[PDB]
Structure formats: C-alpha cells, structure tokens
Amino acid sequence: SSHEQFRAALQLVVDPGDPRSYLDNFIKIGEGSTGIVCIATVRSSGKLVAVKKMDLRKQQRRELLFNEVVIMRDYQHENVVEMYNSYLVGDELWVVMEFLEGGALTDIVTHTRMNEEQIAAVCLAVLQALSVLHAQGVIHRDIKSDSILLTHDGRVKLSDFGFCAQVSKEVPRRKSLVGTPYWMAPELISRLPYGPEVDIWSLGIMVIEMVDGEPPYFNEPPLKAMKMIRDNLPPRLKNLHKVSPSLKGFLDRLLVRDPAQRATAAELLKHPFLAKAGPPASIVPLMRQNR
Numbered sequence: 001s002s003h004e005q006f007r008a009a010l011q012l013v014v015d016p017g018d019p020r021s022y023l024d025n026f027i028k029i030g031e032g033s034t035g036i037v038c039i040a041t042v043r044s045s046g047k048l049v050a051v052k053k054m055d056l057r058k059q060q061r062r063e064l065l066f067n068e069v070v071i072m073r074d075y076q077h078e079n080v081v082e083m084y085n086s087y088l089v090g091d092e093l094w095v096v097m098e099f100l101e102g103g104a105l106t107d108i109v110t111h112t113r114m115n116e117e118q119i120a121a122v123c124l125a126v127l128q129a130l131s132v133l134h135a136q137g138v139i140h141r142d143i144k145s146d147s148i149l150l151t152h153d154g155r156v157k158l159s160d161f162g163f164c165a166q167v168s169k170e171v172p173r174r175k176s177l178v179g180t181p182y183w184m185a186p187e188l189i190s191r192l193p194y195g196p197e198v199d200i201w202s203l204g205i206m207v208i209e210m211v212d213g214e215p216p217y218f219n220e221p222p223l224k225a226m227k228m229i230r231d232n233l234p235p236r237l238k239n240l241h242k243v244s245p246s247l248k249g250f251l252d253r254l255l256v257r258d259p260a261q262r263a264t265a266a267e268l269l270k271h272p273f274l275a276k277a278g279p280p281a282s283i284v285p286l287m288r289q290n291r
C-alpha cells in the first residue's frame with residue numbers, strides 16, 4: 001500500500017516515540033484540511049504548545065506534509081512559528097509547535113479597522129520573514145490573514161506552511177496549483193512556472209484584506225474569481241480613500257501581474273511605508289482579548 005510506504009518514509013524524518021507521553025490536556029482550537037489543531041501542555045515544563053494532527057488517509061496532497069515537517073524543522077526566525085517536534089501517532093502525523101496565544105489576524109480584520117501603523121507593522125514582520133525564507137528558496141504559497149498569528153503582546157509570526165515548497169538553483173520554479181483561490185497570484189492560476197514572487201502578490205491581497213476586510217472577488221465563487229484574477233488587471237482597493245499615498249505606492253509594487261516587475265521581499269524592506277510600522281504594543285489594542 002502507498003499508505004504504509006508513506007508511514008515508513010515519515011518515520012525517517014519524524015521524531016521517535018509517542019508524544020502522548022509528555023503532552024496532555026488537548027483543547028481543540030482549529031479544524032480544516034482534515035487536520036485538527038489543539039493546545040497541549042508539556043508534562044516536563046508545564047509550557048503550552050500547539051499540536052497539529054493530520055490523518056494521512058484523508059489528504060489531497062500528502063507530499064506537502066513532508067515539506068512542512070522537513071523544510072520547517074530546525075528553522076528559527078522571530079517572525080515564523082517555530083516547530084519543535086513531529087511524530088507519527090498511528091495513522092496521524094503530529095506537528096508540535098510554538099503556541100501563539102493572540103490568535104490569527106483574520107479575527108482582527110473581520111471585527112476591527114486597522115490603521116497604517118499596525119498594517120505596516122504586520123507587513124514589516126511578514127516581509128522580514130519572507131526575505132529570509134525566499135533567500136533559502138522557500139515559498140510559503142498560502143500568504144493570507146489566516147496564516148498570521150500573534151502573541152499576547154502584539155508580535156507577528158507567519159504560520160501554516162502546509163502548502164510550502166522549496167526551489168534551488170537547479171530547480172528554481174514550481175508548477176503546482178496550491179493556495180487559497182482569492183489570494184492566488186496571476187501566474188500561479190495561469191498554470192505558469194512560478195517562484196517566490198507569488199508570495200508577494202498574496203501579501204498584497206492580505207493588505208487589501210487589512211484595508212477592506214476581505215480579499216477581491218470574495219463574493220464570487222472560487223473558480224470564477226480565479227478566472228477574474230487570471231484575466232483582469234490588478235485589483236483596486238474598495239476603501240481607496242482610507243489609504244495614504246505611501247500605502248498605495250507600497251501596494252502597487254506588490255500587485256503586479258508580470259512577476260518579473262513584481263517587487264521582492266528584500267526590495268520591499270527598503271520601502272518608506274514600512275517606516276510607519278509601530279512596535280508590537282501598537283498591535284496589542286487590535287487584539288480580541290480587549291477592545
């Protein structure tokens with residue numbers, strides 16, 4: 001069976017043993033792509049972690065799990081959710097990771113209005129993560145507000161690498177159709193070989209998400225909106241009156257159809273709009289735990 005082959009392959013990269021021997025008090029906090037995310041306690045230290053458990057028999061692309069456990073293990077960056085361990089518990093792959101108590105960014109963009117200082121803080125954090133990640137040939141391929149987690153004190157970390165991939169000098173592009181439809185880049189939906197630039201476009205969409213509270217064509221069906229992204233010009237902000245010229249100039253360097261002229265993360269780190277970025281304390285009030 002291909003299933004047992006995949007189990008045995010995971011045993012070569014997964015941490016040995018049973019995690020249920022030092023983790024307890026599972027509190028379900030997330031669902032989705034046939035994988036539940038729980039909060040757990042570490043018996044040794046009492047610290048809290050997040051455990052993503054994915055059933056291997058219910059996956060459209062099992063290989064991506066591979067990616068997530070291989071690319072992200074030993075990865076350390078202040079703006080990236082750190083993975084500590086991974087385990088194979090029966091037919092379930094468990095990923096043990098840092099627990100972000102502040103929740104996701106979607107919860108903020110659907111309930112409140114963010115200012116340009118906070119938007120610039122979020123973007124600076126995401127771009128600092130992305131410059132390193134792309135320098136190592138890692139493409140997140142699912143940049144959206146759901147993939148942004150926060151601490152209680154307002155620190156921003158990138159998360160949900162379940163679609164990520166790696167490119168090299170030998171293999172510099174991907175051709176798979178992954179991501180969430182409304183955030184996908186034009187070259188990606190157009191079945192074109194793409195590189196890290198798709199992460200920039202998606203970041204741009206998230207900026208729209210932080211301005212308008214939703215991505216473009218959110219009302220349309222997924223495939224219809226994907227065709228619209230494929231054919232139409234770069235989408236324009238609905239709440240265009242609320243954004244400063246600096247933010248519009250920043251966003252224009254992100255939502256470029258041609259990936260060759262789309263700005264890179266390293267370039268965007270030099271943009272003046274990110275000077276508006278505030279400290280994590282500026283994100284503290286946006287949190288749901290208050291307001």
Ligand SMILES: NC(=O)c1cn(-c2ccnc(N)n2)c2cc(C#CC3(O)CCCCC3)ccc12
Pocket residue numbers: 029030031032037050052068072080081082083095097098099100101102103104149158159160161162
């Ligand atoms: N479905 C949900 O609701 C999720 C909730 N969290 C968390 C996690 C921690 N803290 C909070 N507050 N939420 C998720 C984390 C991921 C993930 C990931 C990685 O790729 C990140 C890099 C290292 C390997 C693993 C996927 C989904 C959810």
